[PDB]
Short mmCIF file of C-alpha atoms in Angstrom, two decimals:
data_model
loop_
_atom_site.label_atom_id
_atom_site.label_comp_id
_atom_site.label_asym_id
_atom_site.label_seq_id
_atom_site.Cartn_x
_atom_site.Cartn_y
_atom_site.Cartn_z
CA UNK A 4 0.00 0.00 0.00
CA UNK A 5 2.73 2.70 -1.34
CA UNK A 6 2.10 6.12 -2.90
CA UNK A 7 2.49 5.86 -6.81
CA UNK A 8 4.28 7.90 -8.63
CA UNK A 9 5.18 8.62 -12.89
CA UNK A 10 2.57 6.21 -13.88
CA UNK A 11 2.83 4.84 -17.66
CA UNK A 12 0.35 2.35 -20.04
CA UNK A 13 2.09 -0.03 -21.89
CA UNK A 14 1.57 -2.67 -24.22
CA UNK A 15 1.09 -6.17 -23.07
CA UNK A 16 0.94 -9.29 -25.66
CA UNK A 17 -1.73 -8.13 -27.99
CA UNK A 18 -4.48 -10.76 -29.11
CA UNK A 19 -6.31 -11.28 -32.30
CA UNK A 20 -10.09 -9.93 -32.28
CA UNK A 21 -12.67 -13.08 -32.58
CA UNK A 22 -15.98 -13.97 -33.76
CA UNK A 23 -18.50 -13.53 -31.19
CA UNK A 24 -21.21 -13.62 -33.17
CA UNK A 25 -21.60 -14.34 -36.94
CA UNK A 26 -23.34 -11.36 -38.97
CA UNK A 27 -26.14 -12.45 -40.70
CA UNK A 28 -29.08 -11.17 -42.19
CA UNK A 29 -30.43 -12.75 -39.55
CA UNK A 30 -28.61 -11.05 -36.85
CA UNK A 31 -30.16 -8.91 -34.25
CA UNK A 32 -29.45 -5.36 -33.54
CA UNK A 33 -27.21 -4.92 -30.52
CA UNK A 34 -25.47 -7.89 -31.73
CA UNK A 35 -21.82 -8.11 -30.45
CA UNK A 36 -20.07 -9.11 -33.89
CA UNK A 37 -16.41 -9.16 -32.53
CA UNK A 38 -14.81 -8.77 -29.06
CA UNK A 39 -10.97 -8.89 -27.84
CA UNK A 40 -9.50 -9.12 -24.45
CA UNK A 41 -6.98 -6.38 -23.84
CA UNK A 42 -4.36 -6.14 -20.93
CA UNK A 43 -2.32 -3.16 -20.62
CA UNK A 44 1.13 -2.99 -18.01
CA UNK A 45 0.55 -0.21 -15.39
CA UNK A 46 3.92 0.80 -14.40
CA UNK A 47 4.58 3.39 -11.62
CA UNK A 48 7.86 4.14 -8.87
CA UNK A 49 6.72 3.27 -5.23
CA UNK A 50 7.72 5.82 -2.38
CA UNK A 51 6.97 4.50 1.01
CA UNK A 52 4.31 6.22 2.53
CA UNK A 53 2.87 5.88 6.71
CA UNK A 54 -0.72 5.95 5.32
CA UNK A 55 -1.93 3.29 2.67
CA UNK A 56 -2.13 4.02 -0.85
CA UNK A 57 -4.46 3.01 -3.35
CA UNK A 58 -4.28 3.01 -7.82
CA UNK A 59 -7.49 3.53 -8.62
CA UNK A 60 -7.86 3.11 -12.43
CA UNK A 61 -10.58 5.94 -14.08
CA UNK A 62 -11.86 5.55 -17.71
CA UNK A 63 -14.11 8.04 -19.59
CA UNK A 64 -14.59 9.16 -23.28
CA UNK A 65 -14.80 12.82 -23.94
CA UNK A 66 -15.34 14.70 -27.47
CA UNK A 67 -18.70 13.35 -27.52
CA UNK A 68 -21.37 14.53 -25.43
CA UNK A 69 -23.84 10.90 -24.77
CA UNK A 70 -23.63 7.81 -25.84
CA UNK A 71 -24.89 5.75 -28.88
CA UNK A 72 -26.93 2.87 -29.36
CA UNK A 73 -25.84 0.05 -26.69
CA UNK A 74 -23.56 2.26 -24.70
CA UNK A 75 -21.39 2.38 -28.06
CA UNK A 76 -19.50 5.39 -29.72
CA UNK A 77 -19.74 5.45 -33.59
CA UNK A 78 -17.35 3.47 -35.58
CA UNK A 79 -15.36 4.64 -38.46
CA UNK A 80 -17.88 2.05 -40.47
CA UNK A 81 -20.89 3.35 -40.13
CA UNK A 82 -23.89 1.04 -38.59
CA UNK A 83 -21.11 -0.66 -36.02
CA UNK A 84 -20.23 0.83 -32.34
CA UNK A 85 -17.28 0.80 -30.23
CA UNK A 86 -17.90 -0.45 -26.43
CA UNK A 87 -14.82 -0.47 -23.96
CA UNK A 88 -15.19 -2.11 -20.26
CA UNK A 89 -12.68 -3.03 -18.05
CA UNK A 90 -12.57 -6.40 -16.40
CA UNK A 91 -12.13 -5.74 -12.61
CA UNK A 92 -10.94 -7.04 -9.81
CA UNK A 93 -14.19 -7.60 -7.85
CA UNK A 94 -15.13 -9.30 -10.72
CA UNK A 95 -17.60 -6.89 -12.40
CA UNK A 96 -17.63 -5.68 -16.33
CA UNK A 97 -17.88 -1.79 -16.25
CA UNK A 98 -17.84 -0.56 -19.59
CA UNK A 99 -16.08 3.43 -19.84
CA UNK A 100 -18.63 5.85 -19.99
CA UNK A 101 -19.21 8.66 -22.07
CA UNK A 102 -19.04 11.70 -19.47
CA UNK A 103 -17.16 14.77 -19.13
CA UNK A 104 -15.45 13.01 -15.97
CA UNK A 105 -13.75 10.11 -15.38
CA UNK A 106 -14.99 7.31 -13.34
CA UNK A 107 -13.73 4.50 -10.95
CA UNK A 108 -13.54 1.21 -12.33
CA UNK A 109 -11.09 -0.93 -10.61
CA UNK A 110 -8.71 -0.29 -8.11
CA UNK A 111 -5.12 -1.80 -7.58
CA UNK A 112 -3.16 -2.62 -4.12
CA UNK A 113 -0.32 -0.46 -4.21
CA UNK A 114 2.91 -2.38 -4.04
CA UNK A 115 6.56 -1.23 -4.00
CA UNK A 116 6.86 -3.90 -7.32
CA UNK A 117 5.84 -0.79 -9.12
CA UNK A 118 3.75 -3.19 -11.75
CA UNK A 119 0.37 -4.19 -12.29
CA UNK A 120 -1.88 -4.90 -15.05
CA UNK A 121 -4.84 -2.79 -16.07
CA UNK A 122 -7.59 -5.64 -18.30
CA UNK A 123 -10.50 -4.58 -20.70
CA UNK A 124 -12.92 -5.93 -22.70
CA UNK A 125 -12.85 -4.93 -26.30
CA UNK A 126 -16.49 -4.91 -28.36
CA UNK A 127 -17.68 -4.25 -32.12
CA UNK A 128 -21.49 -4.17 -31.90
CA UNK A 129 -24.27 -3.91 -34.71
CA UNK A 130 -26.22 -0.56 -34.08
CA UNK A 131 -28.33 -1.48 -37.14
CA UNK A 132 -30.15 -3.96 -39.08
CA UNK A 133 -27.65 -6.14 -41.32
CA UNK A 134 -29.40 -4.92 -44.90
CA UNK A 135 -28.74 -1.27 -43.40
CA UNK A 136 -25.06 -2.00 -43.64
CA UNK A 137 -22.60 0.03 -45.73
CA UNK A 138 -21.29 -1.58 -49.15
CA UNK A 139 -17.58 -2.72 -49.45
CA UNK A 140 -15.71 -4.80 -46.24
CA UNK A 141 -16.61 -2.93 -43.74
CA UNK A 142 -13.31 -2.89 -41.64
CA UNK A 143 -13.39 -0.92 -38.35
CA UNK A 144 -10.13 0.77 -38.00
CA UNK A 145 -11.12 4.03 -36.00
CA UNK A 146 -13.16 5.67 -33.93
CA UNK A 147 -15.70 8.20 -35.89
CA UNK A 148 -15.23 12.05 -34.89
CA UNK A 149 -13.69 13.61 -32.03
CA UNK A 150 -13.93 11.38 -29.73
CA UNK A 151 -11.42 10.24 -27.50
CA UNK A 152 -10.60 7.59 -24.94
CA UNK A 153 -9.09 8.67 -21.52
CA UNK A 154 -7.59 6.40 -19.25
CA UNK A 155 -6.89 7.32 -15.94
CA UNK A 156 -4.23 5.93 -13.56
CA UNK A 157 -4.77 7.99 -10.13
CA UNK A 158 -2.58 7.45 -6.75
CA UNK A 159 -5.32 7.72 -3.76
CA UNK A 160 -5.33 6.97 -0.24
CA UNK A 161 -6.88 3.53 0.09
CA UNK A 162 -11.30 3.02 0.04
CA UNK A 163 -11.63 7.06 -0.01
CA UNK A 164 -12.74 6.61 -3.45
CA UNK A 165 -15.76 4.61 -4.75
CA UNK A 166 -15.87 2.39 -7.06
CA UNK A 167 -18.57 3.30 -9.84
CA UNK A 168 -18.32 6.69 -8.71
CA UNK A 169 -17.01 9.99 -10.46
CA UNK A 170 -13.46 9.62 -9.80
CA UNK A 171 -11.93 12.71 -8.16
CA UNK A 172 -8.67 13.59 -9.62
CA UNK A 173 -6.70 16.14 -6.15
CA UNK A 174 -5.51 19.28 -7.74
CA UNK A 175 -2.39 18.98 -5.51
CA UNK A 176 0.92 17.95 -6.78
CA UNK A 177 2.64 15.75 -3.70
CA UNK A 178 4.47 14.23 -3.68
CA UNK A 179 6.62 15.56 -6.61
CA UNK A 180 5.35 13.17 -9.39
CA UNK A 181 1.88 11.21 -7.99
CA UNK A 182 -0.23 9.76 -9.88
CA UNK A 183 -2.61 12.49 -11.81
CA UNK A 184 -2.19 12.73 -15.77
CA UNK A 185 -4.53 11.16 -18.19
CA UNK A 186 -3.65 8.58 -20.94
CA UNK A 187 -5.64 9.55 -23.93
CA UNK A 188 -6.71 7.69 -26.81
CA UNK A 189 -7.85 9.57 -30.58
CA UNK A 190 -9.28 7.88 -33.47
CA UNK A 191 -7.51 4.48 -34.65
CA UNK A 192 -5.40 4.67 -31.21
CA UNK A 193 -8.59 3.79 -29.13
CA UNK A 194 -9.51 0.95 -31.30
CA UNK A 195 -5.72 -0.18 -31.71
CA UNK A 196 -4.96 0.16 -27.58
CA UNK A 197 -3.40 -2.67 -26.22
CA UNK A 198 -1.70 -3.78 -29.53
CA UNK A 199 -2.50 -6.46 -31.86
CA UNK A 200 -4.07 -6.46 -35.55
CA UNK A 201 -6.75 -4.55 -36.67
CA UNK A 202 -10.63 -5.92 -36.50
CA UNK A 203 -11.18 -8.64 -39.53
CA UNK A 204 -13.03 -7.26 -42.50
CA UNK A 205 -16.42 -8.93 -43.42
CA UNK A 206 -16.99 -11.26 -46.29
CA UNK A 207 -19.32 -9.71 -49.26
CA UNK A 208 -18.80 -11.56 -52.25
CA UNK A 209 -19.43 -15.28 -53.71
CA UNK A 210 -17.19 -17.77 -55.55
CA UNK A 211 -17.11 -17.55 -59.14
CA UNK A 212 -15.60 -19.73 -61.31
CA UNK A 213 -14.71 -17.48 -64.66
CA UNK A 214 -15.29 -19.28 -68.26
CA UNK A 215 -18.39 -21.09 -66.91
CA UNK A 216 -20.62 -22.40 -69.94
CA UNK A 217 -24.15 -22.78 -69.96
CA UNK A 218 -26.19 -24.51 -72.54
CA UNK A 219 -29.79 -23.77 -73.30
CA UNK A 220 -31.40 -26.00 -75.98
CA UNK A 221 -34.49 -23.92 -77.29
CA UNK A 222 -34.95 -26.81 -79.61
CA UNK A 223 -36.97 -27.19 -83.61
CA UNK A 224 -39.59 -24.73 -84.32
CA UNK A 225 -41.79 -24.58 -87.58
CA UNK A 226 -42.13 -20.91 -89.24
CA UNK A 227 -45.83 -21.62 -89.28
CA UNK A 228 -45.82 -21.53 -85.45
CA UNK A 229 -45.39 -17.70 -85.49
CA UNK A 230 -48.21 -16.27 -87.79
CA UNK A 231 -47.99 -12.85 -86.47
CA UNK A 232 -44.42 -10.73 -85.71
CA UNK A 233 -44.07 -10.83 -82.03
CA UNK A 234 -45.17 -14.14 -81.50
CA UNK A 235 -42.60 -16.63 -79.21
CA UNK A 236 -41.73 -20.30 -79.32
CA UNK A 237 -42.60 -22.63 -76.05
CA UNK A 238 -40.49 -20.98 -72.89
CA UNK A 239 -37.35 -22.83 -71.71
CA UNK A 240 -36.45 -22.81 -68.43
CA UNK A 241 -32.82 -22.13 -66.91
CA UNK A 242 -31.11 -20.80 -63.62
CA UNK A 243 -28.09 -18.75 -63.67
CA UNK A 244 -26.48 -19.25 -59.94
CA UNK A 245 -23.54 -18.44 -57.27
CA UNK A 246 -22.52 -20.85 -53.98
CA UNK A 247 -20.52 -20.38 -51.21
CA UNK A 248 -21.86 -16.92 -50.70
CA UNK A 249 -20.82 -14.60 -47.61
CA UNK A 250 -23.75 -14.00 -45.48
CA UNK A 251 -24.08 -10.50 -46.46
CA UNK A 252 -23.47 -10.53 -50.19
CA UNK A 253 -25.57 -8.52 -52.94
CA UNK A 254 -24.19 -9.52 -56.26
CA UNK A 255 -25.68 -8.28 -59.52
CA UNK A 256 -25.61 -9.86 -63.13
CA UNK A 257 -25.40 -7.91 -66.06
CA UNK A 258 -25.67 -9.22 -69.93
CA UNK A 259 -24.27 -8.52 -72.97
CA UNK A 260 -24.90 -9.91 -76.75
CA UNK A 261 -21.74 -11.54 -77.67
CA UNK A 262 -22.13 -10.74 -81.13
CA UNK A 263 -23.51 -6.96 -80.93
CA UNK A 264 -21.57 -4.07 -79.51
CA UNK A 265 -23.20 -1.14 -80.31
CA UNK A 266 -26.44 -0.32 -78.18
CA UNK A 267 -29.57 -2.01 -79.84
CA UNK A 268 -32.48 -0.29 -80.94
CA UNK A 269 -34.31 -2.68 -78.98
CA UNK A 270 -32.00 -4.68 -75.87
CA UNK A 271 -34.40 -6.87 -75.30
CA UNK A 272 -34.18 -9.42 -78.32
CA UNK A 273 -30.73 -10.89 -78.44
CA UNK A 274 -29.54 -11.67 -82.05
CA UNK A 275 -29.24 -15.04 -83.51
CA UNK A 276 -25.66 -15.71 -84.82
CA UNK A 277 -25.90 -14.81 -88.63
CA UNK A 278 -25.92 -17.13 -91.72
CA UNK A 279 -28.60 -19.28 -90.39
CA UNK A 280 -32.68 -18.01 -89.65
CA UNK A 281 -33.95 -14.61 -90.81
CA UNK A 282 -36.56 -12.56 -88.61
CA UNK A 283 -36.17 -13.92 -85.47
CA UNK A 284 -34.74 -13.46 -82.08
CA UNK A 285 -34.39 -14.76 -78.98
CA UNK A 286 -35.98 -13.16 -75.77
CA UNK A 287 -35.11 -14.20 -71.84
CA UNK A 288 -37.89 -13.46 -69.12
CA UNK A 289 -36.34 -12.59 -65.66
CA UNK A 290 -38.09 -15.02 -62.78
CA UNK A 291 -37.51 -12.63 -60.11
CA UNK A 292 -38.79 -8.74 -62.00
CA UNK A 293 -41.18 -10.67 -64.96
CA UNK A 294 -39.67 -8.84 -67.17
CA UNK A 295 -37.42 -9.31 -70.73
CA UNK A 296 -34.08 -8.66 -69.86
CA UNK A 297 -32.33 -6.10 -71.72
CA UNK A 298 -29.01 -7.05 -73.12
CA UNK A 299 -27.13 -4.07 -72.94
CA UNK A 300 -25.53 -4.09 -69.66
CA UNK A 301 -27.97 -2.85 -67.36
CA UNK A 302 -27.36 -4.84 -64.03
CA UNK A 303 -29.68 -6.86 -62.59
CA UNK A 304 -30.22 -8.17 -58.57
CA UNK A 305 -30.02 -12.28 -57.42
CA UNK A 306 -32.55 -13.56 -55.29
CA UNK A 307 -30.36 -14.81 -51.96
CA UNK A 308 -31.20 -18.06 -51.01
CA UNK A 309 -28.87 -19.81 -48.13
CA UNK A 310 -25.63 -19.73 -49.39
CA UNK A 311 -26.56 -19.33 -52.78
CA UNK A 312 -27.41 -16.26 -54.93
CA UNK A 313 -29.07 -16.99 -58.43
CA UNK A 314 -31.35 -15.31 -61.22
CA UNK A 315 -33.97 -17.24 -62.68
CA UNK A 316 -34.51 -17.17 -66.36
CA UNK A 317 -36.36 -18.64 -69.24
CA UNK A 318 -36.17 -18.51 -72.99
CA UNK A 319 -37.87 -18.26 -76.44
CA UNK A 320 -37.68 -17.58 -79.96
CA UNK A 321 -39.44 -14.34 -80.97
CA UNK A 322 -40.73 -13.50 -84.18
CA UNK A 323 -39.45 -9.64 -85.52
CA UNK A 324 -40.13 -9.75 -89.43
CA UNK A 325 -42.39 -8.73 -91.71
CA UNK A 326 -43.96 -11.64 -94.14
CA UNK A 327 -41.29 -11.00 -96.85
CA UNK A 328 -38.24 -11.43 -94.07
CA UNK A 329 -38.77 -14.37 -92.70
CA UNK A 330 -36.20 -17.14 -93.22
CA UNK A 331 -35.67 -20.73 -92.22
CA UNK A 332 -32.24 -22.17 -90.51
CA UNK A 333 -29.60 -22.80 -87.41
CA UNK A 334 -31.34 -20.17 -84.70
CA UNK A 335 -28.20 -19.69 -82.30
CA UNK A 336 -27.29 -17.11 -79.63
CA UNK A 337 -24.95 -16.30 -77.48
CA UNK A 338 -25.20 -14.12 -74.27
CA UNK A 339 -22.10 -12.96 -71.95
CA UNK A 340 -22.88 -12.27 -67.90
CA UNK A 341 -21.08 -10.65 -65.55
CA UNK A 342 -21.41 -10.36 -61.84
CA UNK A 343 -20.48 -7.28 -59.91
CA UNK A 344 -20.54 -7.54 -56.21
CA UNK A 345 -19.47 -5.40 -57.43
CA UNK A 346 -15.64 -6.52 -58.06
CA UNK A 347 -16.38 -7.62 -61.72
CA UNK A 348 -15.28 -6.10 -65.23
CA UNK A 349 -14.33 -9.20 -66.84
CA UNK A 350 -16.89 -11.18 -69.06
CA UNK A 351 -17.76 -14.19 -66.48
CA UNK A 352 -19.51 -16.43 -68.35
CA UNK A 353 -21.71 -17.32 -71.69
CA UNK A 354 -25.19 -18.73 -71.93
CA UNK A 355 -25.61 -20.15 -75.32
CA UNK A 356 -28.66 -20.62 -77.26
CA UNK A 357 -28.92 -23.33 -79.50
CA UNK A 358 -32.13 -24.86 -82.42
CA UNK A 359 -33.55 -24.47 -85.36
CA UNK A 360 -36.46 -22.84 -87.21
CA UNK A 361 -37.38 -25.54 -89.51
CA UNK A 362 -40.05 -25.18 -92.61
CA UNK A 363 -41.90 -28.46 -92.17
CA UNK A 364 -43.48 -29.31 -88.78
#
């Protein structure tokens, strides 16, 4: 029970943030999506003293008037808080407040040693719903604003101070070098105290294997079976579809014709490879919108199912000519997809269209 004097923080061995919780869309607000255990050295010189001495260990975070949702303070990624709590001795969790002043959280036998250890409780939490969530990773590496974390290491004579109480800091000076000063904490500091890497990112995209083929077989059609222009052959159905999706992901698919460039007077008929039929086209229904889809590029949202995003689709022939166009032959098409989570540009994949518009039945 010595008086304390030149008090310093330090880094102890720093540990890796873990999963506490698994974000979801599922997930609940308040959820605690990460947590770390952080112990800092307290190192101070003893003096001998006749009366007993007490550390009392103060935390508050200033530069921020109250508190956000779940006793957080607003991450650098938005929708996720920042809780602190310290660990203490008589075994309660007291998280730091948010208060002009600091307060008493634990308190530490003073010994002539001139070490201790100061232990907290680290906390990312979900302040929103997981569909509110910012696009992109997500990583937490700071603090948002102003605000800053204050840890106080204070020399005072032993039990005068309460725990859970506003923790009086003496104005006085003695003896030359007690215990007084604040440690203080701004922006990626308070997240990074203690040492030890920065909070994971969060999974948002889904495996895709690149080249993937897909064959539709629209199959033989007689001329005869589209008497008027606009008129379609019997639907074919087909699912274009992602696994081993992160919980979170929102990918989009987008199409191209593979063998037209230029913006089409009309995006919804995709072309039939030339030298073959005359007057006709094929057109693809989305499942999802009921709606042609337009094969210009416009991108399109996957239903989420489990761990699996896909589009649904179906196909047909259409008719476009007039009575004096219309020729028989090899109908084939060819349509290029890409996904954008987005983290696509390159051409992911080809649906191909195969049949025939025969004369005869």
């Amino acid at each position: 029970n010595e008086v304390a004097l030149n008090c310093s923080f330090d880094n102890g061995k720093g540990l890796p943030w873990r999963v506490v919780n698994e974000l979801t869309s599922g997930t609940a607000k308040g959820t605690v999506l990460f947590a770390r255990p952080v112990s800092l050295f307290l190192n101070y010189k003893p003096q001998a003293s006749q009366e007993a001495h007490e550390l009392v260990i103060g935390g508050n975070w200033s530069g921020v008037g109250y508190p956000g949702p779940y006793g957080t303070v607003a991450s650098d990624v938005k929708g996720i808080g920042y809780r602190i709590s310290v660990d203490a001795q008589d075994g309660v969790k007291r998280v730091i407040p948010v208060d002009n002043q600091p307060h008493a959280l634990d308190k530490r036998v003073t010994s002539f040693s001139g070490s201790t250890t100061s232990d907290y409780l680290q906390e990312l939490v979900l302040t929103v719903d997981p569909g509110e969530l910012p696009a992109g990773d997500l990583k937490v590496t700071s603090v948002s604003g102003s605000a800053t974390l204050n840890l106080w290491a204070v020399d005072r004579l032993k039990g005068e101070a309460s725990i859970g109480s506003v923790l009086a800091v003496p104005a006085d000076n003695y003896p030359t070098g007690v215990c007084r000063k604040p440690y203080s904490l701004i922006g990626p500091a308070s997240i990074a105290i203690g040492g030890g890497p920065p909070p994971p990112p969060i999974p948002k995209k889904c495996k895709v294997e690149v080249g993937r083929e897909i064959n539709v077989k629209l199959g033989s059609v007689a001329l005869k079976n589209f008497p008027r222009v606009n008129d379609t052959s019997t639907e074919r159905s087909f699912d274009i579809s992602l696994s081993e999706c992160a919980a979170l992901a929102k990918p989009e698919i987008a199409f191209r014709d593979k063998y037209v460039s230029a913006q089409q007077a009309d995006p919804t008929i995709l072309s039939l490879k030339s030298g073959g039929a005359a007057g006709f086209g094929i057109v693809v229904k989305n499942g999802l919108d009921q709606q042609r889809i337009r094969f210009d590029g416009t991108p399109y949202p996957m239903r989420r199912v489990g761990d699996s995003a896909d589009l649904p689709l179906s196909a047909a022939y259409i008719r476009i000519g007039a009575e004096g166009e219309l020729k028989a032959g090899v109908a084939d098409g060819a349509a290029e997809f890409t996904f954008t989570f987005p983290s696509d540009n390159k051409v992911d994949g080809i649906v191909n269209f195969s049949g025939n518009i025969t004369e005869l039945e």
